[PDB]
């Protein structure tokens, strides 16, 4: 155990740099494997292992499109000619990941409509295109994409199909029109509990208790401090819900916990160094997050759509921009972002360089 | 009176200087009041004062809402380490000054309504987050932020919150779906008069003519010509509410009015240098948000929200965007504006050094 | 034909040659035309004759409102001090020409409502303006700003006026809430193979064949590789159409196919170096602009607007921000667009430069 775990924490460069040599297709599904983990800012291969694994406990058909969506991606990459370190750290895989599981979640026709696969196919085709794109933008700025590119092939995806397509409709989206009756004795300390684990499940579209503590597994293996602030800020996403009175069954199902969970990793020691204000910083993006995510979940019913993770990426590209004069709320250097204990250690470093 | 006078015109920079060794809760005063007369660009307390009587004088509820605010984003610049210089300019406070009224004006649930002051604080708390992203974007361009993080602030609140929320509760907006009929033989010259100042007054949600008349004494003795562009403007959204066919009604409580206002004063002097020529622009600029305010009006009412200064920002950026071959339409050096006379004696050496 | 062919193939630069010292008013009738045709990237008064006649085809009235819009506009950017070499090649004109065709296209009033001319001469006097400002921002990144002008102007009216304006009431836009009946038996070969002129001619909103064939011919007069990706690019809006099961009425009448036409010229040797590897990536753009244009268009629906071009702008600018590592696939520096043939060769001049 403890000389095993070393070489599966982190982002198993080890195992990066010794494939290297290794039969190309090998190296293709560690890319495939880093691409599904990177969902949640992981590069790590068991990690995206344990995440499919969480996958089929929800559903094997979704588990089966966003494998599928991840490959055609990565195969597209290549012939698209993108930089080869974006791609074997899965960069230009986990837009297409979420493209794959979540056509299935918002289709209407249900499991195993094998036509499905064609749009999973196609619009995983354009993700390496919206990934190189927005890149070409956001690196000026040293910004991420996020899963931009996810958000803007789903929400395409969604309005061209919509209801009513003969051949892949969607799911119904309805705007609230009536004000939830709210009975809050009702209220179960248990469920909430639970609405933890289910907020980070819900990252993938999964609603099963089990899939987010498998995920949670998987974010613990390869950090421990990101696994620490995906449950925090889904537990702030649920605070916020009972801050603005949501209806419970929303809450259970972890719809207000899953952008507040990633917005917490990014920001708690990801790309802001993990002082105790950026982890301050980062519950603040967290609740923040969620208010948002509830604001665009209505703004986009009135047209049909759900908000996915627009939320996310909005508010935490939006806490990203942000300047300060406070030395202790830095952003980390792109090209030295790994994961927060590792990110931590460079921060700690640079600042003794500074005092000097 | 003349000597008098001279200490409280323009932005009362002997003043500022003289309160940098007072006791430092003088200087916060002074930084509220001219966070809150930065809605009109103007920077100077005692008009801030003065647009706290007018706001007293439509509802002290949204006086009390909007110093509320001012005062929560002022504090909340501080904690996350902002420039001094725009804190003590009341850039860090006019965007919650209108977030705290414009949340009390749209608000179901009607004067003093106490629970309201928690997202009304929780909604200050972003405005400088907003405002630092934003000024570290455009700044770059060297544009200003105008109220973009009010704006944002604002849809994101009431799309969050919505009309059927059970604690916070909007007021319901509804597209028009009839057409309206129009009388021309009841309209009334005393009426579109009075529109002028009440158009100037809805740049705080104040439709009070009285407001407005306060409002425009406020700007007045910061400078003339800002005033003089204040109701112009507005007068300039009536001509284009009744070009329009607009329903008098809205007309007459100022809805035509506050965003052209606000794109007259920008324009006029403020953030161009006043020649004939950016004077004709700024009345030409004025009409086209009148135009673009009802469009999105209209757009948004389809999502259930409010416009509110939308068109203004996205209006004035776009001409301050546009260039020119022409030496006498001179947008100003941000580092340099100040006030139009000011703005105005730094154009014309400027351009003497150039015809040198 | 031989000896006289020459002179009207390309961008005609004898003939603006010769026209530097010619009479203003002649000088200004061919920015007029050029303006006319760069509606479609062709520079050249004679396509933007020919182009003028398929308008009058259509529709004598949206031929009026059209060249209207094409003056007004150009005169305005000369009132602004605008650069002469772009306003010379048209590129101030053609976004107002799409404003004065589509807002006829658009009015529920018909043809020959004269009040009309108001509303087209006020937003084609923001054509520059909207031109001038986003020019500002794209020519940064070496980006043309296509049709953002237009589209921006034409949304912006349509939000104002609606479908209830009192005076210039739009045309009703209706969401799809129904599945449409489709019955495969009746497709028709020969109105898919009409669909594609059809598609051409939607791109100054004319759904009448012979038009979209004289648009064609004015295409391929300058450029026989503009018009090969004109046709080709309605041809694969088609194909998309009918991948999402569209109704046949909406192929037929062009619907599907003017948005990828205008991306696969663009991309197809326009604003990238024309090989192989180029082609095929045109031929995605117009499959991906394609399904863009109709989830664009339910959107849109569902806040009352059409979409008319933002999908092309949108899409076409993707890709052409997209970077790869091939050097096959290569962006024209925009200071040396002109027309696919001769960018071609400008092309393989600088690679046997690189070969060097
Ligand atoms: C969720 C929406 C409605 C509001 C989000 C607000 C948070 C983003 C704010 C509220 C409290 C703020 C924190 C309160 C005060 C502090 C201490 C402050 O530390 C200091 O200024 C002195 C110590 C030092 O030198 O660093 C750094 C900012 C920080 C973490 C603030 C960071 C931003 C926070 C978390
Ligand atoms: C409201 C929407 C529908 C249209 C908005 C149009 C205005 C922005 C346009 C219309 C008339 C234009 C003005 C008409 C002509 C002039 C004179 C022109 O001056 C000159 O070109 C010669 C004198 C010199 O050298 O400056 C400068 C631009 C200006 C003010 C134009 C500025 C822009 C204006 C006000
Ligand atoms: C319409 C939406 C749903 C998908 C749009 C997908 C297209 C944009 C993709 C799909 C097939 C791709 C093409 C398939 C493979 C090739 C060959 C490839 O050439 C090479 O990599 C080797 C030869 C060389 O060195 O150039 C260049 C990219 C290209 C044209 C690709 C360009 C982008 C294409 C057309
Ligand atoms: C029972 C737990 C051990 C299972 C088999 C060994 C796997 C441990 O991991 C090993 O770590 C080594 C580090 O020196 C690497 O060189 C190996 O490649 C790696 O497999
Ligand atoms: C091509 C798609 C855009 C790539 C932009 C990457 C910018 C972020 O940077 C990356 O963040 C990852 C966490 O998500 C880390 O695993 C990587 O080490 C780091 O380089
Ligand atoms: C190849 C790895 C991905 C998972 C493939 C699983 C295929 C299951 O197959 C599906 O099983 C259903 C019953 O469970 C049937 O109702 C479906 O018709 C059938 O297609
Ligand atoms: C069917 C999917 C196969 C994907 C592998 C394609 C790899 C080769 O395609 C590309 O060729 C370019 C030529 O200039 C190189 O620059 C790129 O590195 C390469 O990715
Ligand atoms: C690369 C993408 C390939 C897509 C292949 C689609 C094959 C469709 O297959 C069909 O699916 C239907 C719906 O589930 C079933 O009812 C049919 O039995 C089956 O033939
Ligand atoms: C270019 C694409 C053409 C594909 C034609 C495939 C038709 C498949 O079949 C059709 O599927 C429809 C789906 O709702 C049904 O409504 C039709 O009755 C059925 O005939
Ligand atoms: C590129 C187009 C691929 C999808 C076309 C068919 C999708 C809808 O086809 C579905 O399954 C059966 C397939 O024959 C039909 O009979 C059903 O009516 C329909 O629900
Ligand atoms: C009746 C009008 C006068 C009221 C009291 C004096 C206020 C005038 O203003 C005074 O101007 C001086 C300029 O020399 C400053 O030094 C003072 O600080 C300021 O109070
Ligand atoms: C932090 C929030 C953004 C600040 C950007 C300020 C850019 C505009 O600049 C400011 O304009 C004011 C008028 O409104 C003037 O009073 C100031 O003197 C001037 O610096
Ligand atoms: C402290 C400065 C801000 C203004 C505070 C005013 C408090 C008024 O108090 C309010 O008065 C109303 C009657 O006018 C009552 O109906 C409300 O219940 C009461 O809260
Ligand atoms: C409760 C509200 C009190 C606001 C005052 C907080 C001022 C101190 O907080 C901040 O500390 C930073 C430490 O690096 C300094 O750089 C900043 O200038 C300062 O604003
Ligand atoms: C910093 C923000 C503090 C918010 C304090 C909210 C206090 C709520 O106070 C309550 O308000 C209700 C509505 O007006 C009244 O009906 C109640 O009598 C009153 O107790
Ligand atoms: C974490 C936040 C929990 C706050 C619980 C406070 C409940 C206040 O009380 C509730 O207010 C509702 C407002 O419409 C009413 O509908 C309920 O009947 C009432 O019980
Ligand atoms: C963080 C949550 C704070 C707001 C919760 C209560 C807001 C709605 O509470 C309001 O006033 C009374 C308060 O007891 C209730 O009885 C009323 O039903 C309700 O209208
Ligand atoms: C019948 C076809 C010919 C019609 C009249 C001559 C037009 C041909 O075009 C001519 O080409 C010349 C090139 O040397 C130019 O110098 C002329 O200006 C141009 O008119
Ligand atoms: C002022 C309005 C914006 C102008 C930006 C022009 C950038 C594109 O560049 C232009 O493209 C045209 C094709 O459309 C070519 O005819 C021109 O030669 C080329 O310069
Ligand atoms: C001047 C060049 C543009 C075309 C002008 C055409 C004017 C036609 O005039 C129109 O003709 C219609 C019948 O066709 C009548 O019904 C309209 O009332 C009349 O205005
Ligand atoms: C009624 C329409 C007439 C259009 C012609 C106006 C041309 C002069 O107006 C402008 O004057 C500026 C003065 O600095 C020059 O810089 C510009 O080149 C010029 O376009
Ligand atoms: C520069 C713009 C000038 C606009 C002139 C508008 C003249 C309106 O003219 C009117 O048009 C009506 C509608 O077609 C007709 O019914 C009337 O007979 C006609 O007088
Ligand atoms: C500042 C602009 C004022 C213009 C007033 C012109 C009134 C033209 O006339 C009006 O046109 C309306 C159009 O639907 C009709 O409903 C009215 O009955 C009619 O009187
Ligand atoms: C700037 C305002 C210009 C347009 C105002 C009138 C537009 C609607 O006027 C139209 O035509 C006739 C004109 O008298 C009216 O009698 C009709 O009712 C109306 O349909």
């Given amino acids: 155990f403890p000389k095993a775990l070393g070489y599966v924490t982190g982002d198993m460069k080890e195992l990066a740099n010794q494939l290297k040599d290794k039969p190309v297709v090998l190296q293709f599904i560690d890319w495939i494997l880093r691409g599904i983990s990177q969902v949640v800012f992981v590069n790590n291969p068991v990690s995206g292992i344990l995440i499919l694994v969480g996958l089929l406990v929800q559903n094997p058909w979704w588990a089966l499109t966003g494998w599928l969506g991840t490959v055609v991606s990565t195969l597209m990459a290549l012939l698209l000619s993108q930089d080869r370190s974006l791609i074997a750290s899965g960069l230009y895989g986990y837009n297409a990941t979420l493209v794959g599981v979540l056509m299935a979640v918002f289709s209407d026709k249900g499991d195993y409509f094998w036509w499905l696969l064609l749009p999973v196919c196609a619009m995983s085709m354009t993700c ?8 070409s933008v956001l690196s000026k700025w040293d910004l991420p994409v996020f899963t931009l590119p996810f958000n803007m092939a789903l929400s395409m995806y969604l309005s061209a199909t919509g209801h009513y397509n003969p051949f892949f409709p969607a799911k119904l989206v309805i705007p609230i029109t009536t004000a939830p009756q709210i009975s809050w004795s009702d209220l179960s300390a248990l469920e909430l509990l639970k609405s933890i684990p289910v907020g980070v499940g819900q990252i993938y579209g999964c609603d099963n208790p089990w899939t987010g503590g498998i995920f949670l597994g998987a974010i613990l293996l390869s950090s421990p401090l990101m696994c620490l602030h995906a449950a925090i800020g889904s537990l702030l996403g649920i605070a916020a819900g009972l801050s603005l009175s949501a209806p419970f069954e929303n809450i259970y199902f972890g719809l207000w916990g ?17 002082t105790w204000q950026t982890h301050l910083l980062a519950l603040g993006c967290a609740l923040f997050t969620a208010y948002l995510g509830v604001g665009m979940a209505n703004f986009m019913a009135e047209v049909g759509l759900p908000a996915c993770t627009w939320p996310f990426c909005l508010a935490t590209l939006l ?38």
């Fill in 128 to 135: 390496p295109i919206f990934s190189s794109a927005l890149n």
């Fill in 319 to 356: 806490f990203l921009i942000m300047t300060t004069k406070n030395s202790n709320i830095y952003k980390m250097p792109l090209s030295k972002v790994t994961y927060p204990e590792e990110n931590r250690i460079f921060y700690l470093q640079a600042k003794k360089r500074m005092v000097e």
């Fill in 258 to 274: 899953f952008n507040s969970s990633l917005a917490c990793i990014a920001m708690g020691g990801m790309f802001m160094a993990l």
